[PDB]
Design a protein around this ligand. Sequence first.
Ligand SMILES: [O-][O-]
Ligand SMILES: [Fe+2]
Ligand SMILES: [Fe+2]
Ligand SMILES: [Fe+3]
Ligand SMILES: [Fe+3]
Ligand SMILES: [Fe+3]
Ligand SMILES: [Fe+3]
Ligand SMILES: [Fe+3]
Ligand SMILES: [Fe+3]
Ligand SMILES: [Fe+3]
Ligand SMILES: [Fe+3]
Ligand SMILES: [O-]
Ligand SMILES: [O-]
Ligand SMILES: [O-]
Ligand SMILES: [O-]
Ligand SMILES: [O-]
Ligand SMILES: [O-]
Ligand SMILES: [O-]
Ligand SMILES: [O-]
Ligand SMILES: [O-]
Lengths: 164, 162, 162, 162, 162, 164, 162
Amino acid sequence: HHLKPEMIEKLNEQMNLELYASLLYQQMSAWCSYHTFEGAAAFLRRHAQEEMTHMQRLFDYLTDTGNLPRINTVESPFAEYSSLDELFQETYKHEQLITQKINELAHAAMTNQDYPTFNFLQWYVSEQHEEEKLFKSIIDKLSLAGKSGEGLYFIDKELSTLDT
Amino acid sequence: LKPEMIEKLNEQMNLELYASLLYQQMSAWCSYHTFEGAAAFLRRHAQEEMTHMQRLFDYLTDTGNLPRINTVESPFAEYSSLDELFQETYKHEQLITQKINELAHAAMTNQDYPTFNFLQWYVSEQHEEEKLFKSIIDKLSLAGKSGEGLYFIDKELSTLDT
Amino acid sequence: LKPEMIEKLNEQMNLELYASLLYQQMSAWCSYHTFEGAAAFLRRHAQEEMTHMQRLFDYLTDTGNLPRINTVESPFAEYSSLDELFQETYKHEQLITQKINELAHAAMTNQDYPTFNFLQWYVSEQHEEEKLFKSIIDKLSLAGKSGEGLYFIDKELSTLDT
Amino acid sequence: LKPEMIEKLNEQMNLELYASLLYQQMSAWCSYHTFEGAAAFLRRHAQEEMTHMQRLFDYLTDTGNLPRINTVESPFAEYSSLDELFQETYKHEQLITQKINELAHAAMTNQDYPTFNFLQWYVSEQHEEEKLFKSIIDKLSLAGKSGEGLYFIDKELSTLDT
Amino acid sequence: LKPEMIEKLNEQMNLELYASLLYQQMSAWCSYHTFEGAAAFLRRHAQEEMTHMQRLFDYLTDTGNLPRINTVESPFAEYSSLDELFQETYKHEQLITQKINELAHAAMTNQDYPTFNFLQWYVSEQHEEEKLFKSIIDKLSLAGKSGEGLYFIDKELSTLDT
Amino acid sequence: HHLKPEMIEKLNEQMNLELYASLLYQQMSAWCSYHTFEGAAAFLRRHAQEEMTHMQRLFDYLTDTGNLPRINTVESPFAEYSSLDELFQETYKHEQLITQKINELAHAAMTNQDYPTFNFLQWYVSEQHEEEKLFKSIIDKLSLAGKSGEGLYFIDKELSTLDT
Amino acid sequence: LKPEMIEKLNEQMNLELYASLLYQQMSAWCSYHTFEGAAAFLRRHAQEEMTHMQRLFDYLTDTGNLPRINTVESPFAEYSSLDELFQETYKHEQLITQKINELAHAAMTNQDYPTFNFLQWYVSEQHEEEKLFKSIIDKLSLAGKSGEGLYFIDKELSTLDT
Ligand SMILES: [O-][O-]
Ligand SMILES: [Fe+2]
Ligand SMILES: [Fe+2]
Ligand SMILES: [Fe+3]
Ligand SMILES: [Fe+3]
Ligand SMILES: [Fe+3]
Ligand SMILES: [Fe+3]
Ligand SMILES: [Fe+3]
Ligand SMILES: [Fe+3]
Ligand SMILES: [Fe+3]
Ligand SMILES: [Fe+3]
Ligand SMILES: [O-]
Ligand SMILES: [O-]
Ligand SMILES: [O-]
Ligand SMILES: [O-]
Ligand SMILES: [O-]
Ligand SMILES: [O-]
Ligand SMILES: [O-]
Ligand SMILES: [O-]
Ligand SMILES: [O-]
């Protein structure tokens, strides 16, 4: 009648991963701002907020099922980036990690015959397809136009209102 | 900004982040213990603390500095009652008040008038924060000694400050 | 559909009908004991259970099968308290959830993707049902130990989920 | 109420429930045999019968009694034709009409004016029911001897009685 | 995506394209034989199948793959009657259903949860497709044995599902 | 009183050519998407839809005149393209083919004294003038600005809303 | 205009007038045989033919010519059936189409581009006319073999093309 402990903890850990993603994109916004990419910064701050809502959805599934979500220690998301391109390469990699972890969670759910949690997960499976499309689109814009300061100026302006 | 001020500002941004996560984490305790109204209030307040963090983050970027989100300590705790939880929220907000005062003092000592000015938003906010969390404890002292009293205070929390 | 699936789908249709008449019968106990608010919630939720019936009925007729309404045993029971009555509704919902999960497992085993898909509505509905009925138990545990407590909870149930 | 009138009212409640389940089970036959308009009318009618149960259920609870949903025998049956099914529905309505007149007679001869008054809703409903179900068997006798005629009557049934 | 899944997805996109062209081609038979209502319905449905093709096309591009529209076999056929035409539409839709099931099975076996998820739209759609084309055959069995019956069914088709 | 068999078949064949054009532009949209030209892709998908309506108009003239349109075998439109420019060179060539075939059909109509079909064709004669203008405009934008990744970025954005 | 063109344009003006009075006369047969719907369609279409007259009349006067209304022979005919009557309207339309095509050929031969252009309205109108009148024949072939069939077709004709 209740979630297995395995499933509870994997859901908890994914909630933390969503929280880390939020703090990551927030931290990356600082780099952007520091390096004068205000458009890239605004996009990343809005995307950080979005990741909180992914975190909250997991938190809510956990409480709705009679469990206690646990926010664990959070590693500093601080990193050096050599370019805006390398920053957004890292974003895409991170989103690929999140997709992997959701697929693992879905695999655990099916293997455990946890149909409620499999069903809950579908939101994330779908979301992660949209996330990879979004961030791959940014890398693609940069690989096309990003090799000059003018190109970066334009893409940075695009990012300032992207996905709004 | 002088190094001292950069460091204290960056620390405060991290304290505001921690406040957000703490209130989020307390909302899970509340839901877990059937106080869904207290949970709603703390979830809302967690969102609020993120905006406080954000305001510091943006001051630091505005001034040519690089804010740095440091390792966050887990906010996980046990509480013996909804009262004790809200005693802890109040103590936390008194800590944030104190650090804001220290920051204001440092700004004034360093003749940093742009930061002293920036800080006034927090001084004012922290006055409102303490009044709000005090109000909650006060409600609990009054009515909170029974299941019914907690029931009503919980319901009051569900829409408090909205 | 495979015979196993037809039979388990028809059985679940009948269980949702049973749940309807159960909650309908429960509303009588409530009325009889003066809990007109609990009565009203239970009468509304009896209607909702018939829609869960119809959705299975429809899937069965859509797929070329003839659903059968089988004999329904009397849902009549004694309850010792409002709290015990809602402990029984919660257990009943848990049983429905489990039946649904068995059906989903069966669909998977039988490689019945149409039926696995159809069942997802029930998986999601049952998560909401368990939450609803647990919230009721949780209100009664908290505040339900006095007549005054029960008066308020009954009042809340009069508009709950509307 | 007098024990006799309690029992007769409770049995009528159960007869209304049975009518519901019967018209529901008939709608399945109709779907299986491709009369989806006839199926839709019977599904809607099944829902109306449930409201007729709710009205008796509610009079019993209002008068400080405890209505009991008794065991309901499966309403499953074979039908040789759509016309036969609708002959059966008309027959079942005549039964219901008869049990209502018997209830009205029992109320008047027991000097039970409250219950007499309450029953008038059913006296007038059962007049409307008979004219509705008579109308369908009349349409079928006129036009229902060809596939084309059943086609059109089925279509009329899809939206009949809104 | 794994090679197997790319290939099966690409094949299904091509099956959906073929469905569109088949329904278009059947609409020409219908117009040619004076059933302009059946023609309108099949022209509309051809448009629908293109959106199904399109949804697969976009999943393939989204996932970094290159969808490939292969040689399309002529859909030209003779039909002996409007009934036989609509028997063939139904058989085609059962074929699309089956291939969607195979794709769902493959996705699940390969632990490809993004494709399994993507596929649910089709599982659900194919349930609706079979109900719709079944309804059409069913109408024809009932009423379609005469010029008048075909006349009316044709008119019904002109605005069916709009 | 009826169309000549010559005219019926030439009209049938043009309907198929319009269908092929649709599948062509749809197939070309895949190349664009694959090569990150999402704007070019959206334009080509919208243009594919347009070609279906050209197909349908022929189909309808055929049925209105008591004939049976026939969809024939359709060759795969799959091709390799070395650049976005070369892709849109191919589009223009294709549209030039369609214009040729319509002019041949008009010439057959006049030669056969088929005034109904000549009149019907005028829609296409006019449409093909507008099609060549449209696709020549795209080649011209590319020859002007298309020689850098930045130029391609801008034209690709133009294509994303062109002719809407 | 060349004398050949003036004469063929005037003749066509007279043919469109004839068509008017023909369809008007046909509406009488229909009325007389109780097909008031067919009557009404034919009366509306008689009006439309006069507008085809006026358009040629106007082109003739615009170009400096004097159109002449010549003797119109009685359009009176016997018809054996509604179907035969509409077979005759269709043949009549075919004749008009052919006359128009002859006129267009003449304009081309005479290098009369103004007149070739003017005639295009008629080429396009005549494609629509043949479609309209063929659709009527087609309805009657399908469903017109019974009184009941004819009743429905007559009803459709009462609002056809309005
Ligand atoms: O029975 O109404
Ligand atoms: Fe339930
Ligand atoms: Fe005419
Ligand atoms: Fe996320
Ligand atoms: Fe994300
Ligand atoms: Fe249920
Ligand atoms: Fe009734
Ligand atoms: Fe009834
Ligand atoms: Fe075209
Ligand atoms: Fe074109
Ligand atoms: Fe005319
Ligand atoms: O996520
Ligand atoms: O704070
Ligand atoms: O703060
Ligand atoms: O359910
Ligand atoms: O009744
Ligand atoms: O399909
Ligand atoms: O499909
Ligand atoms: O075209
Ligand atoms: O004409």
